[PDB]
Amino acid sequence: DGGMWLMQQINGQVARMKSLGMQLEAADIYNPNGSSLKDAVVMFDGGCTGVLVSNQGLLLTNHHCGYDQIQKHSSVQHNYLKDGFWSYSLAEELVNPGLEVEIVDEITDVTAAVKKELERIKKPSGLEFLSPRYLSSLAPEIVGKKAASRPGYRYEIKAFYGGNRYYMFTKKVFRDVRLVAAPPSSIGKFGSDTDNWAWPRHTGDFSIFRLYADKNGNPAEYSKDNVPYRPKRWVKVNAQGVKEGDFALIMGYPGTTYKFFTADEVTEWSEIDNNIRIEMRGILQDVMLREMLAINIMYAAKYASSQNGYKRAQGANWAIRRRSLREIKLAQQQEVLAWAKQKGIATTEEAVRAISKAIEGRQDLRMRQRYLLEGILMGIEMSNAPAADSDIADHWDDPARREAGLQSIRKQFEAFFKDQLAIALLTRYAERIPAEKQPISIREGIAEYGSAKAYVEMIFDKSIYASRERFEEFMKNPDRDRLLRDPMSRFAASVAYEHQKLAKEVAAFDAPLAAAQRSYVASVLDMKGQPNLAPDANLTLRFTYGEIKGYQPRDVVTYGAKSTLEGVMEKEDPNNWEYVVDPKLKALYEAKNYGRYANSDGSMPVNFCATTHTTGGNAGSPVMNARGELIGLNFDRNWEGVGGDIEYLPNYQRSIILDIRYLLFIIDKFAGCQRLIDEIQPQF
């Protein structure tokens, strides 16, 4: 199994899908000529998925997708992160500036078109035929006035199959997306650390938004007279529950896969990107833990993000050792190599040779890129330190410029908001990177101060952005020269410099590599048929299907397909931030007050898992039953499924899904927001 299918690949798959129990027509799911399910599956925050579930544009996504919004409306008397949030009228729904949600108007093959505007490039770079920025900046010339016209629409074009296809997505872009509801963190990220990437799972990973339109029902900035968008198609919520072996369909926006990796590629990604992440985030997850001195670990967002990718890395390294992945890809790469030879072709073979060549050439440079990335760019927040704009430098003596320049600073600082973390990371960074290959500021700082430690310490001492209260003191009496010579802004600047410098040099290998990549995939595409080959993920809309089914992780151990509230009670621990259970939830358990939302055996459902092929970016994806109705929301994969980006394994890999009845239960029985039960209209 496997495959994240193009929406227009549905005809080639509808067959097998009905086989496993689907009772939908291909055109129910994707319809070029009009209304279909594709119209209900939206992209959230350019990172997650979401689904429209009412005619008033109600939008279901994951708690961890909407975590930042909630944190942004949260405060000491708000604190929606802790208590959750429940709006009872359209007016109560919160506004969140800078949050976008893209629907897909339609999908157009633009392969021929793109390839021509690709030729006739004066001395091309070698990288543009993949770059979405460049590829989307071709859209007007393809569709004319209507592009760069409708303010609501946006035109996205990406490379598929290594660059052997290009498809275009006409995106309606909504810019007033409002926060309806959220559960408390105790439910939304229950087991946040331990249970992450794990099945069994007991997490209510949901949150609710709504799309707002204008009087005529179009994408819109925020306006006090915006109104609930009336969707073409929204998905119906079915609450008659699920049983093992049921058909399950997922539609959403998978971000990245490497299913066409050659053997040498697997090994590099493992030994370079993956391991450097393991090394570096391990240090971070150390120093940031052992500051164990009481506050709640639950709301440490930076830590949580890092740890989430740390664990995925760990589980990827694992699957490469234990699932024998390099050897699996090697077997694939040599099928096509065989097929080529037998058809007397040499294009295939010289690609693999090239791919391996590019790899060994860029070893030092990619390694450098990655230590910089993991160790400093992501790890150390000094890298996002404010920089003085032109006003401050040039026009300090024009009170208007100066105040705007200063207000550029306060703006930057706010987005920038600790000592020993930077030390630990820079210390190890400096050990791995020869001083001459370090960023100017760093190797010079270590020169003066004789240690990465002392250099770091200097910064936190001499800098204005070291703490909020230090900063505000400075702004009481701002000084020009002080702003221009801050050691942390220097750091941030030198680190970014090396970042772009590395990327320039390494282009010498990446470009041969992408070319060779394209050749190789062509061969595969030649061997198999495009209708039967699902491309890598690229944050565009895909579907995947399977069944609700558990697995056997071990000898003697069997995991089932479905999870219940008793699992929550079993894990309870008042002394573990992670497993604190909400009293109102507990009371409900010991009252067994599950209304019509309970399983057949009278247990209260929480999650379930299925054989669908999802990945990062799929968070929030709708999960639908055989008839197209919504039975759940995707939010994770299991530990054994992490190596599915490289190769899908049908008997370990599972998508971890929130039971839609758990969501309902929480709104209804826990929160009391009947209004939203009423808008959603669960079907029984």
Author numbering: 22 to 315, 319 to 441, 451 to 717
Provide text from the study.
Here, we show that dipeptidyl peptidase 11 (DPP11), a central metabolic enzyme in these bacteria, undergoes a conformational change upon peptide binding to distinguish substrates from end products. As previously reported, the overall fold of DPP11 comprises a bilobal architecture. The upper helical domain dictates the specificity of the enzyme and caps the catalytic domain, which has a typical chymotrypsin double β-barrel fold. The active site of DPP11 lays in a wide cleft running through the middle of the protein between the catalytic and helical domains, which contributes to the formation of the substrate binding subsites.
We determined the structures for the inactive constructs PgDPP1122-720 S655A, PeDPP1122-717 S652A and its complexes with the dipeptides Arg-Asp and Arg-Glu, as well as the substrate Leu-Asp-Val-Trp, at 2.4, 2.85, 2.2, 2.1 and 2.6 Å resolution, referred to as PgDPP11, PeDPP11, PeDPP11:RD, PeDPP11:RE and PeDPP11:LDVWs, respectively. In PeDPP11:LDVW, the third and fourth amino acids of the substrate (Val and Trp at positions P1′ and P2′, respectively) exhibit few interactions with the enzyme. For instance, Val (P1′) displays a weakly defined electron density with only 40% of its solvent accessible area buried by DPP11, while Trp (P2′) completely lacks electron density. This active site design renders the enzyme’s specificity more relaxed, with selectivity imposed mainly at P1 and P2 residues of the substrate. However, our crystal structures of DPP11 in complex with LDVW and dipeptide RD are both in closed conformation, excluding the possibility that solvent released from the protein’s cleft would explain the larger increase in entropy upon substrate binding. When compared to unbound PeDPP11, the r.m.s.d. of the helical domain is 5-fold higher than that of the catalytic domain for PeDPP11:LDVW and 2-fold higher for PeDPP11:RD and PeDPP11:RE. Particularly, the unfolding of helix α14 (residues 320–346) and loop F441-K451 upon LDVW binding corroborates our hypothesis that protein conformational change is the determining factor for the opposed thermodynamics signatures observed upon peptide binding. Consistent with the measured endothermic binding, we propose that energy is absorbed from the solution to break key interactions, such as those stabilizing loop F441-K451 and intra-main chain polar interactions that stabilize helix α14, but possibly in additional regions of the helical domain. Upon DPP11-substrate binding, the increase in protein conformational entropy counterbalances the overall entropic costs in protein-peptide interactions (including loss of protein and peptide degrees of freedom).
